[PDB]
Amino acid sequence: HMGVRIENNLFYVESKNLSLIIENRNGYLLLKHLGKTIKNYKGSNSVYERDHAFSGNPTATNRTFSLDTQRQIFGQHGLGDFRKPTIQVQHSVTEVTDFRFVEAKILKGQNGPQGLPSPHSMDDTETLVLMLEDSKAQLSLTLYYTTFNNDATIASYSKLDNNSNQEVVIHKDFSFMADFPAADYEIVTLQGAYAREKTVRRQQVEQGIFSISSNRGASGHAQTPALLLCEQGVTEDAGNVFAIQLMYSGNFEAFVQKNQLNEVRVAIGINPENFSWKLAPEEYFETPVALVTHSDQGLTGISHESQNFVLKHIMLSEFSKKERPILINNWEATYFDFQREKLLELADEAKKVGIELFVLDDGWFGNRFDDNRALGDWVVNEEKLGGSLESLISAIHERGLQFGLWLEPEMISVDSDLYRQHPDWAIQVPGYEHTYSRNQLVLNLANPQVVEYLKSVLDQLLFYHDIDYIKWNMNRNITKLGNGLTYLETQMQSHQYMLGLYELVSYLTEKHSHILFESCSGGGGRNDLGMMRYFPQVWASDNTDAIARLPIQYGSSYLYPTISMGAHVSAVPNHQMGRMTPLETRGLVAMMGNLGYELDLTNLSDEEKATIANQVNLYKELRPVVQLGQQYRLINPDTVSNEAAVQFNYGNQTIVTYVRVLSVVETMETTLKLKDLDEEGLYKLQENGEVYSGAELMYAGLTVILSQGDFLSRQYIFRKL
């Protein structure tokens, strides 16, 4: 039985196979258990209350009760707990608060912070509402924990109300925190860099503080809003994992602190850096939604739990189970140098190879002949497109292709009519020169006039044109914060920017819900669950190299479903890596993602065209298995591995893709075992027609054979009889 229960001084938040059990101890909230379901909890793992030196107390005479030593669900500074705090509010002459539990209620169904991306499909949910007050400061803090009946995830956020008659300032306000008992732990995060997105990192939890954070105003290429606290020795197949993640796309922090007693705190939320929030009397602030997800089935267990929750409760219902079109994108194909003739020729060739959607990338607007001007000027360049966009779209439609279009709405070039008309719309500091990045500036989406302008321009574009797909790029990070009328308003503008972005994209995606929107940020610069609430796919990386894509895809699909993960077959030598790879390998690697194409089809040989047509035919078959099926990592492409292998199961279909990076010699063949088959099931391998029992494939495995050479790949295709 799942949902929320209040039983004496215990609160039980009960999702599928995951419980959070909280005790009200005289107004203090104690984390008793987070993990697998326990009913009738007695307290076997209660903290032993001891006099711990230099750990102080709320009363004079009791040295054994200390907030420095109790396991909690939110952290304050100044009351004796010296671990990193997750709520800190300035009021009058202090930033000490003492929030005490006052009242609990339970909600059913849809529930979340206003103006921030939050779970959908919430009919079968309950939400625990923990109302806390600081009587002296006349502030309220309300904690929300929501259950899910179909996933081992709990969602959380808080609301802070100013009930005083002075201005108060929020300095810290995270979305989730948990104190875990002293034990050995490891952590997994996804970091990396541009063209190396979502690099999977694993390390031992050590005394002190480890953190990942973005202060770039976007979540960023080099860190994802996720932190996995793992049982020592976790594998792909076994051990406990708790994943904490944030549905937010701006500045964030995730941290793990191991204190002086070996206790462990984890939290995620809005980054304290670049953040303060003024609340006038009666005003309130709600945090973005955090998620805590659990598996006892190792890292593959947590992947599945996280992917399922995303598919069911984050990604738009309209698209979460809808096969995505195989596209052609002209970007690497032509860059800025194109016109109508070239576009339709490319469309002609895309149609012949069975591609479904044609995306017109950067360069169609203003005087955008390079990347040094025109952002902000969303006016069709009818000269370059050889007539109206409407006439181009009709042409593409008449050739049997859906039509897609690139935008970068959050940006403005100095050399643009927009900047000439409104220079104050850029993020900037009075009396400081701009900082430039790809020779462009960022629009101040904390300015409601900016948001209004973009809603108008884009609504016009989408209503007057028959566009099937949008690619929403964002190609620099935020510098020179100084647009506020006060310092405090500047401190608010980075979060207000996000609120502005979310108002904009929720509006357009809702008002044009037939359109498939793909998010982008020089690839995976903002590939997080805030964006995935509105954009059901994402351009995973500007790196389109088949081999460099291996670790990128590993990380990009670690917590997010494969269906989200844009992957394109591109030209050789590869533009980022300067590398030759087989077209077969480029194909098989992209087919582990959401397949498209990004190269000049008009310049290929007859043979290369035929190969591509075969790849398209193959993927039309594999697409449901890849996009709708269950993913199993078999060999992980890490820093030392020479191999990658990923399996997908979907009903009677099982496929396995294998890639070897460097050629080897006098090295015995790898044995590759499949996972999650029926032992007694019979599996017919397409290439040789041989029928193998599931037990054979899982416990004996495939001897993997390759010729001599770098970057070779193969695929095994099975049908269960």
Ligand X SMILES: OC[C@H]1O[C@H](OC[C@H]2O[C@H](O[C@]3(CO)O[C@H](CO)[C@@H](O)[C@@H]3O)[C@H](O)[C@@H](O)[C@@H]2O)[C@H](O)[C@@H](O)[C@H]1O
For residues 310-369, which are near its own copies according to CB under 8 A?
A: none
C-alpha triplet 178, 179, 181: angle, nearest 5°: 135
394 vs 479, beta carbon nearer its own copies? 479
Q: Which of 14, 95, 134, 528 is catalytic?
A: 528
With contact defined as beta carbons under 8 Å apart, do 658 and 711 qualify? no
Q: For 693, list phi and psi in degrees, rounded to 5.
A: -70, 155
Residue 459 interface partner, choices ligand X, its own copies, none, CB cut-off 5-8 Å depending on type: none
Of 5, 57, 340, 584, the residue at the interface with its own copies (CB under 8 A) is: 57
Report 144-183 residues binding its own copies (CB under 8 A): 169, 181-183
Active-site residue flag, 687: no
Q: Does 96 bind its own copies (CB under 8 A)?
A: yes
Q: Spell out, one character per residue from 450 to 489, where the chain touches its own copies: x when CB under 8 A holds, - when not.
A: -------------------------xxxxxxxxxxxxxxx
Instruction: State the minimum distance, in angstroms, from the CB of residue 51 to ligand X.
Output: 6
CA–CA distances in Å: residue 13 to residues 24, 246, 296, 586: 14, 19, 18, 46
Binding residue for its own copies, selected from 541, 630, 631, 649, defined by CB under 8 A: 541
Residues of the shown chain interacting with ligand X in the complex, contacts defined by CB under 6 A: 53, 331, 335, 361-362, 371, 406, 438, 473, 475, 520, 522-523, 539, 542, 575-576
702 near its own copies, rule: CB under 8 A: yes
Closest CB 284 distance from its own copies, rounded Å: 21
Q: Which of 222-230, 284-292, 613-621, 624-632 is the region at the interface with its own copies (rule: CB under 8 A)?
A: 222-230
Site string for its own copies, 386-425 (x = CB under 8 A): ----------------------------x-----------
Residues in the chain: 721
The C-alpha atoms of residue 299 and residue 190 are separated, in whole angstroms, by 13
**182 has which bridge partners?**
none
Interaction partner, residue 218 (ligand X, its own copies, none; CB < 5-8 Å by kind):
its own copies
- State the minimum distance, in angstroms, from the CB of residue 568 to ligand X: 9
Contact 445, 504 (CB under 8 A): yes
CA 492 to chain centre: 23
> What is the smallest separation between the CB atom of 453 and its own copies, expressed in angstroms?
23
What distance in Å separates the CA atoms of residue 454 and residue 409, rounded to the nearest whole number?
A: 7
* Residue 55 binding: pick among its own copies, ligand X, none (C-beta 5-8 Å cut-off by kind): its own copies
Residue 365 or residue 683: which is nearer to ligand X going by CB?
Answer: 365
How many residues interact with its own copies (rule CB under 8 A)?
Answer: 193
Report, in Å, the least distance between residue 402 CB and ligand X. 18
In contact, 469 and 327? CB cutoff 8 Å: yes
Nearer to ligand X, 321 or 438 (CB): 438
Contact 375, 438 (CB under 8 A): no
Q: Do the beta carbons of residue 672 and residue 658 sit within 8 Å?
A: yes
DSSP string, 583-652: HHHHHHHHTTSEEEEES-GGGS-HHHHHHHHHHHHHHHHHHHHHHHSEEEEEE---SS-SEEEEEEEETT
Report the C-alpha gap between 47 and 30 in whole angstroms: 10
Report the C-alpha gap between 31 and 180 in whole angstroms: 9
> Which residue is at the shortest CB distance from ligand X?
522
Cα(181)–Cα(173) distance, rounded to whole angstroms? Answer: 23
Q: SS3 letters for 665-685?
A: CCCCCCEECCCCCCCCCEEEE
Binding mask 654-693 for its own copies (x = CB under 8 A): -------xxx-xxxxxxx-------x----------xxxx
- Hey, which residues between 571 and 630 contact its own copies (CB under 8 A)? 573, 576-580
Q: Is 236 a catalytic residue?
A: no
Q: How far apart are CA 290 and CA 111, in angstroms?
A: 13
Of 30, 21, 32, nearest in space to 128 by CA = 21
Q: Which residues contact 271 (CB under 8 A, 6 or more apart)?
A: 213, 214, 215, 251, 252, 253
φ, ψ at 672 (rounded to 5°): -110, 110
**Binds its own copies by CB under 8 A, chosen from 111, 224, 303, 308:** 224
CB of 667 to ligand X, least distance (A): 15
- Nearest distance from residue 119's CB to ligand X, in Å? 28
261 interacts with, out of ligand X, its own copies, none, CB within 5 to 8 A per kind: its own copies
| Window contacting its own copies (CB under 8 A); options: 258-266, 330-338, 601-609, 646-654 | 258-266
Q: Which C-beta is closer to ligand X: that of 3 or that of 58? A: 58
How large is the greatest C-alpha to C-alpha distance in the chain, in angstroms?
87
- Mark the segment that binds its own copies (CB under 8 A) among 112-120, 392-400, 401-409, 446-454: 112-120
The least distance separating ligand X from the CB of residue 721, rounded to whole angstroms, comes to 42
To 5 degrees, how large is the angle CA 440–CA 442–CA 447? 150
Catalytic residue among 186, 608, 638, 710: 608
Interface residue with its own copies among 26, 61, 165, 605 (CB under 8 A) is 61
- Interface with its own copies (CB under 8 A), residue from 5, 90, 186, 336: 90
Q: Which of 288, 363, 524, 587: binder of its own copies (CB under 8 A)? A: 524
Q: Which residues are catalytic?
A: 528, 608
